Design a binder for this molecule. Structure first.
Ligand SMILES: [Ca+2]
Ligand SMILES: [Ca+2]
Ligand SMILES: [Ca+2]
Ligand SMILES: [Ca+2]
Ligand SMILES: [Ca+2]
Ligand SMILES: [Ca+2]
Ligand SMILES: [Ca+2]
Ligand SMILES: [Ca+2]
Ligand SMILES: [Ca+2]
Ligand SMILES: [Ca+2]
Ligand SMILES: [Ca+2]
Ligand SMILES: [Ca+2]
Ligand SMILES: [Ca+2]
Ligand SMILES: [Ca+2]
Ligand SMILES: [Zn+2]
Ligand SMILES: [Zn+2]
Lengths: 460, 460
């Protein structure tokens, strides 16, 4: 098999997990096992051991306090930028789980509160700690979240990414989520070594303490400010999935119509770090503004390498994303079982539509359109390649070698199977590529091509 | 399991074939085995043993003859109605296989010719025989077809359905197709008993000699005038499939946009008998004008009971039809793995979307929406039921009993699995039906409903 097919084969297994694997010498958890681990405290605003139940919550920016439940002192109320960013974090949660958030003021009590502190119980300045929060419950301070105003990232969460991230994280605790493992700041000096399972890192959960690098991802110094894939599954386990979110045709990345900063890149220097939740419609990963070689996977639960980062984009369980556009780099685009439109852009790209009737544009450059199986392009649901360049692009059928090397025939099939034919339709200017597969009584594989193709453009 | 689910279960297996079955005490052939049997003469206009190769053929209405190759005499040329109907038959073939037909006149030779006879070699009137034709080849008379002008059905093929049928049949021989079994008129007195395989009947092949009744179908005295399912597979085996036919959104039945008489019903007294070939687009079986209880299946290779007939509609191998509309009768509509829009119409209908994200309208009456498995409506590709009537329609989940009887919960899942919940979204007026299936760690089944539904509308 060619390296183009191999490159797809391996990318499809990027960050495989669960199923009794061991990664970094640790036990590997599936999304759902990570999610049960994150929700092990079994507490939510609906009570203890209540799962799959939605909730309507209130939140409040404290303007003063009689005391802070941790004993810390030097209260300072949220400034305008902290308020705007905290609302974005809340929205990043209610986007994915069945939660509503409504602000209250004055003397009304609230499920989730926000406030800063600046000193410890002794009255001494604290410039060391970052933030903390209290689980849902009926006790004094339940749901309250607290942030160290002496940290610039907390004062400026809109310009310092760790601040927004910290907001999303502490709100997570305030909704009932725990760290993926038993560890907390102030309690010795834990590390990724103490992780219960391999996927305990920022790549999978912003509830983690560990950098995405511990799992092989690399965000180049940036912090995603929104729930990651296992966070989404966890919060949904507690409160149910939100099926009203972005149910129209949604575009993520460049030219985004999400009105969400963490899904939006406005120019090539923007870093994207997100796990997408999308509840309906025909959706596109538009990564067209980057020049880096990217690897984009549209399979649910899978990770992509976008914009020069590694493992920075994923798609949540229960989500189907249909289209992808690469950039000017040499990209790999992998579709899912749906009907996908894949656009490689400039650069020399590898596109794989997988199952379903996909429509493929290699764009400029020397592109390869890869078929891993007869089920990729059946007659009943055939692929189109819409911009094929004779003598420049390639169609890769090397995967079929596993059942006998395919041979070309000019205009008739012998019946021995494992033959490929190109047929030119002069009236429409379409080339039909037919493959009569071993074990098939009828000719069941077809890719239609808008343009001419030569025998030497087909890799067998 | 309910009788609604059972009714779907059985309909899905209507006319099962191949796979070592025996039907009517005979060996059952698959479409492809029937097709190889029909093409056993191994001859086509491209020569002997040439398969999968397209052809550009000519045809001619003889105006006189020096002799007729069978020895029959009393030549009479085609009349205007025979010419129009013969062209429709030719078109019914070139619609499905990669053939073009071009008429020639004067002294030019032609691949396929048409002419009538009226007497035998002795010069005596023949009012008994019907028609015959000669296989492709290089010999004198190859491809010629001949019809008995003393038969009113041959003179009036536009008003007498057996005439048009006979045209399509003899043209079949002229393109290289044989009877499904070794038998021919004049050669003793063959019958369905002599059939090599069970599916040798008009239900499957208009090359057959045997009535559709021999296989349990019933066309109420009508004759389909176009290639049936195994005829399509056969002709495509010889000449390749025609992928340019009806590649837009095509509607079959009432309100048809096919401009084909055999796919078109203009009012409720019209009988439909067809096997559809369609090479692309989003297509609809519109059977809305009938009052009979109908059973409509959108799976490729499957048969339906339409307009009060039995087994009169099928879908050819390699074809995907997406939508169906029933009539005022009590119908069953079965979808395929694609995203299907199913409309039951009036009457009490059973709809089953099967896999994919389907959108279902029960219409007037007491309708049942049936789910046979978790894969029918995953969160990633969920069904909509768009006109659900609380207290009138039903959603049938009885199939899930096979893995434990489903129980209802009001607003939270226990985690034991096999529970169903209805959730009302007041802001949008949508009810979400969630099913947490045994063996699933997350909640993976969802049907969304435009309208209210009661617990007692769900059949577990
Ligand atoms: Ca969407
Ligand atoms: Ca989608
Ligand atoms: Ca590219
Ligand atoms: Ca696909
Ligand atoms: Ca390219
Ligand atoms: Ca190209
Ligand atoms: Ca495909
Ligand atoms: Ca069509
Ligand atoms: Ca279609
Ligand atoms: Ca009906
Ligand atoms: Ca379906
Ligand atoms: Ca109905
Ligand atoms: Ca109804
Ligand atoms: Ca479905
Ligand atoms: Zn924490
Ligand atoms: Zn015959």
């Amino acid at each position: 098999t060619s390296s183009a097919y191999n490159s797809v084969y391996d990318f499809l297994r990027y960050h495989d997990r669960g199923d009794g694997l061991t990664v970094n010498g640790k036990t590997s958890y599936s999304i759902d096992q990570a999610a049960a681990q994150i929700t092990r405290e079994n507490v939510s605003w609906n009570g203890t051991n209540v799962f799959g139940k939605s909730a309507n919550l209130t939140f409040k920016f404290l303007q003063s306090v009689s005391s802070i439940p941790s004993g810390d002192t030097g209260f300072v109320k949220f400034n305008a930028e902290q308020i705007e960013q905290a609302k974005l974090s809340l929205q990043s949660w209610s986007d994915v789980a069945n939660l509503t958030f409504t602000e209250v003021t004055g003397n009304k009590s609230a499920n989730i509160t926000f406030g800063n502190y600046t000193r410890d119980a002794s009255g001494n300045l604290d410039y060391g700690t970052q933030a903390y929060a209290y689980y849902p419950g009926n006790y004094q301070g339940a749901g309250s979240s607290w942030y160290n105003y002496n940290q610039s990232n907390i004062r400026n969460p809109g310009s310092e990414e760790y601040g927004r991230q910290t907001f999303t994280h502490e709100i997570g605790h305030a909704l009932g989520l725990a760290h993926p493992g038993e560890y907390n700041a102030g309690e010795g000096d834990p590390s990724y070594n103490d992780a219960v399972y391999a996927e305990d890192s920022y790549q999978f959960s912003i509830l983690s303490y560990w950098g995405e690098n511990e799992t092989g991802a690399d965000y180049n110094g940036h912090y995603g400010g929104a729930p990651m894939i296992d966070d989404i599954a966890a919060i949904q386990r507690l409160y149910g999935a939100n099926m009203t979110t972005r149910t129209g045709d949604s575009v993520y990345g460049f030219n985004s119509n999400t009105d969400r900063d963490f899904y939006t890149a406005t120019d090539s220097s923007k870093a994207l770090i997100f796990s997408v939740w999308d509840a309906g419609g025909t959706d596109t990963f538009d990564f067209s503004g980057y020049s880096n070689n990217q690897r984009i996977n549209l399979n649910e639960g899978s990770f992509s390498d976008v914009g020069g980062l590694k493992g920075n984009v994923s798609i949540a369980h229960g989500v189907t994303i249909e289209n992808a556009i690469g950039g000017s780099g040499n990209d790999i685009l992998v579709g899912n079982s749906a009907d996908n439109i894949l656009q490689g852009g400039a650069g020399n790209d590898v596109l794989y539509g997988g199952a379903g009737a996909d429509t493929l544009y290699g764009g400029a450059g020397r592109d390869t359109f890869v078929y891993g199986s007869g089920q990729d392009s059946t007659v009943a649901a055939y692929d189109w390649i819409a911009d094929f360049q004779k003598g420049i692009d390639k169609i890769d059928l090397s995967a079929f070698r596993n059942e006998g090397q395919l041979s070309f025939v000019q205009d008739q099939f012998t019946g021995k199977g494992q033959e490929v034919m190109l047929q030119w339709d002069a009236a429409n200017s379409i080339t039909n590529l037919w493959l009569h597969e071993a074990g098939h009584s009828s000719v069941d594989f077809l890719v239609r091509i808008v343009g001419q193709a030569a025998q030497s453009d087909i890799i067998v």
